[PDB]
């Protein structure tokens, strides 16, 4: 009976990740009419075309000068030696006028993406963050209302009701004519997905009792890893975003075919300090885990192999966490895992020349360190806390976590313009600070 749950988890997995494949930024330069005619007339080499015609000149910096400028000259009606065409028209850099790119952009890719189709390249670069912001806002708004809708009609109709919109919205997004409809369909699809996956979690975990719940708590990570791995194969044979979206949508279609309370929890001065430390590490780890994947998906030399390798090293983290639960206290693995995350980034900021060989080893270590630190919190939660039925307090806490997750893409993307290695300092600071707070957890009054 686990096949259904595994399929549902593997279908949910690409939703939070698909921005890596659906939208990517290839190397571009805007179109200047008059160079293609000269290229075909004089037999200009295509590889060396961007050496005598590009306005970026020096590759260092020049983000605006290379991708958002043109050498506005009279390419036609001009006689040239067909060696250095600009050696006589201008005879000097910065002594001839520039301007904004007008006709369009020429991209270097065999496939297509959202950036290529809608031209979010020069001054609309901030429009790409709306893609994740709308999904996170839908995740935020879906938590509050999913409880109310399931009461008046029961859980039988709700589960079937919310597994059809997730496919219809995907198909319609694959058949979208303009940009705003994509955002509307993205929000409508993200309203219900987290609630569906959360309901499936409990539906799968109903049968498992003591011990069995722990054993099946890792099968739901194994299925997530399997779904993450199987997505890299589809993006290799379908290099068009419409085709990939239509190929990952229809599976779901065929798939469907006195008492404990938050009041007692806070007045006691010993159970009040323990939770303000446990509900902050979760926020920090979620922020780091969300940010690292998006950072990797923007500066990867070869995206297909790094993404494949970043799960075969995430697999043994659960095994290590399950190994180290019996013979070792609960704060040493947490402290070590939180310390391993900061040092990885602190070294990543400093390896310039031979970074390509060492990144696939260091980032895997960082991913493993983050993966270990999340399972321990869940195990402690299961061990120590009772069975709360359903609480507006937990609902508000999840809403606040989604509020925190909404802001992250803007800071991740828009802070990289000032300096390339600036977002890798906040992560290190958060990781190093989250290791010094876990040392206040042990009770110092009469511990022995």
């Amino acid at each position, epitope marked *: 009976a686990f096949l259904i749950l595994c399929l549902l988890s593997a279908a949910f997995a690409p939703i939070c990740v698909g921005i890596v494949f659906l939208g990517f930024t290839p190397d571009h330069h805007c179109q200047s009419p008059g160079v293609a005619e000269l290229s075909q007339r004089c037999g200009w080499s295509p590889a060396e075309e961007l050496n005598y015609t590009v306005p970026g000149l020096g590759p260092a910096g020049e983000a605006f000068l290379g991708q958002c400028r043109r050498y506005e000259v009279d390419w036609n009606q001009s006689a040239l030696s067909c060696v250095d065409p600009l050696a006589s028209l201008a005879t000097n850099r910065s002594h001839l006028p520039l301007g904004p790119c007008q006709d369009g952009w020429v991209y270097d890719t065999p496939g297509s993406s959202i950036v290529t189709e809608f031209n979010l390249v020069c001054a609309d670069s901030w429009k790409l963050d709306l893609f994740q912001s709308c999904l996170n806002a839908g995740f935020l708004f879906g938590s509050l209302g999913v409880g109310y809708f399931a009461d008046r009609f029961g859980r039988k109709l709700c589960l079937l009701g919310t597994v059809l919109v997730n496919a219809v919205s995907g198909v319609l997004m694959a058949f979208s004519p303009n940009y705003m409809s994509m955002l509307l369909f993205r929000l409508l699809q993200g309203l219900v997905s987290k609630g569906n996956w959360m309901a499936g979690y409990t539906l799968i975990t109903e049968f498992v*009792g*003591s*011990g069995s*719940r*722990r054993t099946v708590a890792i099968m739901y990570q194994m299925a997530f890893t399997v779904g993450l791995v199987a997505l890299t194969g589809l993006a290799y044979a379908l290099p068009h975003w419409r085709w990939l979206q239509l190929a990952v949508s229809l599976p779901t279609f065929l798939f469907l075919l*006195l008492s*404990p309370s938050f009041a*007692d*929890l806070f007045r*006691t001065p010993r*159970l009040r300090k323990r939770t303000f430390i446990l509900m902050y590490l979760w926020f920090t780890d979620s922020v780091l885990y969300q940010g690292l994947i998006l950072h990797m998906g923007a500066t990867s030399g070869n995206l297909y192999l790094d993404f494949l390798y970043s799960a075969l090293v995430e697999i043994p983290g659960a095994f290590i966490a399950l190994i180290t639960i*019996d*013979r*070792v*206290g*609960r*704060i040493y693995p947490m402290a070590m895992s939180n310390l391993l995350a900061g040092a990885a980034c602190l070294v990543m900021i400093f390896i310039s020349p031979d970074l390509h060989w060492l990144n696939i080893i260091i980032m895997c270590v960082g991913r493993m360190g983050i993966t270990i630190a999340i399972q321990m919190i869940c195990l*402690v939660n*299961a*061990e*120590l*806390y*009772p*069975t709360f039925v359903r609480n507006l307090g937990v609902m508000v806490c999840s809403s606040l976590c989604d509020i925190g997750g909404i802001i992250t893409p803007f800071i991740v993307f828009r802070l990289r313009e000032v300096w390339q290695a600036l977002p890798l300092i906040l992560f290190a600071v958060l990781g190093l600070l989250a290791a010094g707070v876990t040392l206040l*957890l*042990p*009770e110092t*009054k*009469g*511990v*022995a």
Partner: nanobody
Amino acid sequence: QLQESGGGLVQAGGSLRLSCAASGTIFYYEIMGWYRQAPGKEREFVATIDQGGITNYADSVKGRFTISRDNAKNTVYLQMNSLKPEDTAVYYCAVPDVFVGRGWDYLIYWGQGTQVTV
């Protein structure tokens, strides 16, 4: 506030039931256990239980002792059958500290226990 009960005298291969009474605050958010004094020796370890229901046991007493949790009476039970002659000591109810040590050898509570003999 921990309080133990039960105890008595047995001849050979008997059965008796112990009981640890909690306060209500420590019942839901803590972990309970049982420790054996073993006079003339350091204190021993028997079994634990947590909120999920996962139980641990000692190798010497495995297959003989059974621990169960009761929610209506706010008590933690322990059943001992077919007692060996070595099983003779006073038994303490304790609340171990998970975050420090090996997880079951640091105590922050006790209840002074009760005596049993064979």
